[PDB]
């Protein structure tokens, strides 16, 4: 019930090299993968090799994993392969700019987890699957999609020739999987608020301690959210464009509601388009700014994320006031 890549797909991958000019641009937090679809899987291998070294995974098994993950992202407007790699890229930048804070094991786990974090997304919110009344909400009743995504990741690992973690001890194997699980569950935005609040406090009292595993988990979680949302840290044109993609998905789920005489919340209602700038302002102020603010406090090198989010914010203020 999992989808595998073909020999063609994965071998083509092994042969790919990254054009010299992108090398510098990839290191930047605002880098946009948009213009480079062909390369996306190659871009991930590259980021892997630069994070954890060229012989951290067997190249054959790695390329097979990457290409089978691709094949399990659906052709929805926003929760797709492209989102998969963007989040992956942002975590690379974060890992690279904080290199000694994390273990080899965390850097492998987190890059993989980002790639896999929305696997087999159908373009439906957790609310929609539960609130009416899909087979997966009968199976997991909190964080529905995210438990599914992790379970997909594990199913891809368990496929013939795909287990990129096979050469770890079973202690190390069972540790990274646990890193990956927490990482993917942390992408459930509903968990983020409680998590960000804890962290905020712990930082404030000066009681945050990266040697304490439960603290560690919390920081990673925040990192996960900050990567999940990084669309808002691109340059305006890109950000604007991506907003269209996320709204296209919302509105389609709103269209499905309307089809059962149920009015969707305004966020999901394409007849409520002109409230979008306002809604974006809201989101930046209630969700994104606080995310990047706290992330910067804990990991100062991540400041450029906060800096760009601030710029997009002021772009949205400008759309509202009638000047874009
Ligand atoms: C890149 C990215 C990733 C995520 C998860 N979100 N979630 C949002 C919520 C928008 N909020 C709202 C809230 C209320 C609204 C009301 C009307 C129109 C739009 C509205 N919009 N915007 C995102 N952008
Ligand atoms: Mg998700
Ligand atoms: Zn996501």
Tab-separated table of N, CA, C and O and ligand atoms in Angstrom, residues 78-79 83-84 87 114 117-118 121 149 187 227-229, ligand 3:
chain	number	residue	atom	x	y	z
A	78	UNK	N	-0.635	22.678	-1.810
A	78	UNK	CA	0.356	23.145	-0.855
A	78	UNK	C	1.105	22.079	-0.062
A	78	UNK	O	2.324	22.169	0.052
A	79	UNK	N	0.408	21.095	0.505
A	79	UNK	CA	1.092	20.024	1.270
A	79	UNK	C	1.734	18.960	0.378
A	79	UNK	O	1.367	17.784	0.381
A	83	UNK	N	6.630	21.329	-0.657
A	83	UNK	CA	6.616	21.763	0.755
A	83	UNK	C	7.602	20.884	1.533
A	83	UNK	O	8.385	21.353	2.341
A	84	UNK	N	7.580	19.604	1.240
A	84	UNK	CA	8.480	18.627	1.823
A	84	UNK	C	9.966	19.103	1.806
A	84	UNK	O	10.649	19.047	2.807
A	87	UNK	N	10.735	22.812	3.782
A	87	UNK	CA	10.898	22.526	5.213
A	87	UNK	C	12.248	21.850	5.456
A	87	UNK	O	12.999	22.284	6.324
A	114	UNK	N	11.782	16.099	8.469
A	114	UNK	CA	11.326	17.186	7.570
A	114	UNK	C	10.906	16.740	6.189
A	114	UNK	O	9.890	17.207	5.705
A	117	UNK	N	7.597	14.728	6.823
A	117	UNK	CA	6.662	15.236	7.839
A	117	UNK	C	5.197	15.392	7.446
A	117	UNK	O	4.316	15.350	8.321
A	118	UNK	N	4.937	15.602	6.156
A	118	UNK	CA	3.576	15.637	5.609
A	118	UNK	C	3.301	14.517	4.595
A	118	UNK	O	2.536	14.713	3.673
A	121	UNK	N	-0.259	13.574	2.605
A	121	UNK	CA	-1.281	14.564	2.919
A	121	UNK	C	-2.343	14.599	1.816
A	121	UNK	O	-2.023	14.644	0.621
A	149	UNK	N	1.529	10.486	9.160
A	149	UNK	CA	2.766	10.828	8.427
A	149	UNK	C	3.922	10.023	8.949
A	149	UNK	O	4.748	9.558	8.173
A	187	UNK	N	4.851	18.838	14.423
A	187	UNK	CA	4.411	19.726	13.332
A	187	UNK	C	2.920	19.985	13.380
A	187	UNK	O	2.396	20.703	12.538
A	227	UNK	N	10.449	25.477	10.792
A	227	UNK	CA	10.679	25.012	9.406
A	227	UNK	C	9.372	24.818	8.686
A	227	UNK	O	9.231	25.236	7.526
A	228	UNK	N	8.391	24.253	9.390
A	228	UNK	CA	7.099	24.044	8.755
A	228	UNK	C	6.499	25.320	8.099
A	228	UNK	O	5.836	25.222	7.075
A	229	UNK	N	6.786	26.485	8.678
A	229	UNK	CA	6.122	27.734	8.308
A	229	UNK	C	7.017	28.616	7.504
A	229	UNK	O	6.691	29.776	7.285
B	3	LIG	ZN1	3.984	20.906	6.849
